Amino acid sequence: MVSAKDFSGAELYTLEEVQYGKFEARMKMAAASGTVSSMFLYQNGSEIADGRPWVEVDIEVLGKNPGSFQSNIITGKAGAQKTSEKHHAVSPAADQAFHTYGLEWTPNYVRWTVDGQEVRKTEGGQVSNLTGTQGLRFNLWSSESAAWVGQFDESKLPLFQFINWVKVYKYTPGQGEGGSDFTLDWTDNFDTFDGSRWGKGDWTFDGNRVDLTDKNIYSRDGMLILALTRKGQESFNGQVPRD
Ligand SMILES: [Ca+2]
């Protein structure tokens, strides 16, 4: 899908969705005023305004402040969303080093972790409204809401978000591993783009100044790269960072 938008971004998403689990991703985020660099659980179809419930859990690095990320739980329905934005410091800055971002989802709570340390845990409330299944996604784009992400600093493009690896665990309460309540299910070390596991976004949405396209996701040197660039300049010409 293609529009006249001058920029292209990326959205990586799992082809399958699941109910509950732990999701970890080792990554280095991208950040410039005006950008959004993320990791989120998402129930496909939530955007359908037919009275259907919205189910989503977010980790979003807003480009204007690379030293922190916003957490969020989105429930309710399209046009009538219920949110819970919170902010958490990340050191060193999200775009300066790799960190391990974790999301835990059970029937009773959602937990956010950075390098194994909890930064947020929500129990009940919106967690009870996270029904159904959710897929694991990551995207990199730029919001037209200057108040949320800051004025768009186009001069800083191109930008790249690097994903070293992803681990997904099944929710095994009381049956988990090492005493925990999660059992490792699968891991992707991104030595390749595995199309049997992931999809690449190929759409855009209002408020996004970029087209999400398949040309903005690729792998090199054990890293999955998400690119935010001007249209036609999606290729990465640098050296992949080491973790
Ligand atoms: Ca890797």
Curated annotation (Swiss-Prot):
GH16 domain: residues covered = 5-174
- Which top EC class is named for this enzyme in its record? hydrolase
> Could you state a single Gene Ontology molecular function term?
licheninase activity
Listed EC numbers = 3.2.1.73
The organism sits in which domain of life?
Bacteria
Q: Which reaction does it catalyse?
A: Hydrolysis of (1->4)-beta-D-glucosidic linkages in beta-D-glucans containing (1->3)- and (1->4)-bonds
Q: Which residues act catalytically here? A: 56, 60
A single GO BP term for this record reads:
carbohydrate metabolic process
Would the keyword Hydrolase be found if you checked this record's keyword annotation? yes
The residues forming a coiled coil are none
The protein's UniProt keywords, in alphabetical order, are: Glycosidase, Hydrolase, Repeat, Signal
Could you say which protein family the record assigns here? Belongs to the glycosyl hydrolase 16 family.
What is the protein name for this chain? Beta-glucanase
Species whose genome carries this gene: Fibrobacter succinogenes (strain ATCC 19169 / S85)
